[PDB]
Amino acid sequence: LQKKRESEARLLWANKPDKLQQAKDEITEWESRVTQYERDFERISTVV
Amino acid sequence: LQKKRESEARLLWANKPDKLQQAKDEITEWESRVTQYERDFERISTVV
């Protein structure tokens, strides 16, 4: 999520708004999945 | 001034503050030189 989407932000000057909104919703949903994992760490550790 | 310094901003994640301040003072002084040229356009055209 970080390397690929900051490679899209790196490739800003291939100028179209397609990779901009792709960068936005990809970092949003996939960092939401990362936050799901970092909360499931406390979930799994609480089950432990 | 644009391609090279947004290639440094592109290379942000070679993380050190050297190219950050290099990007800052390079875009400052060299876009000041660009503004010198765009004012010297009216200077040269006024001499014309």
3-state secondary structure chain B: CHHHHHHHHHCCCCCCCHHHHHHHHHHHHHHHHHHHHHHHHHHHHHHC
Mutate to test the interface with A, among B7, B8, B10 (most CBs of A within 10 A): B10
**How far is Cα A42 from Cα A20, in angstroms, rounded to an integer?**
33
Which distant-in-sequence residues (6+ apart) come within 8 Å of A23 by Cβ? A5, A8, A9
Q: Residue A5 to residues A46, B26, B38: CA-CA distances in angstroms?
A: 33, 27, 36
**How far is Cα B24 from Cα A3, in angstroms, rounded to an integer?**
24
Distance from CA of A8 to the nearest CA of B (A): 10
Please check whether residue A47 is in contact with residue A33, taking contact to mean a CB–CB distance below 8 angstroms: no
Resolution of this model in Å is 9.0
Selection from A7, B14, B25, B33 nearest residue B5 by Cα = B25
CA atoms within 13 A on the CB side of B21: 3
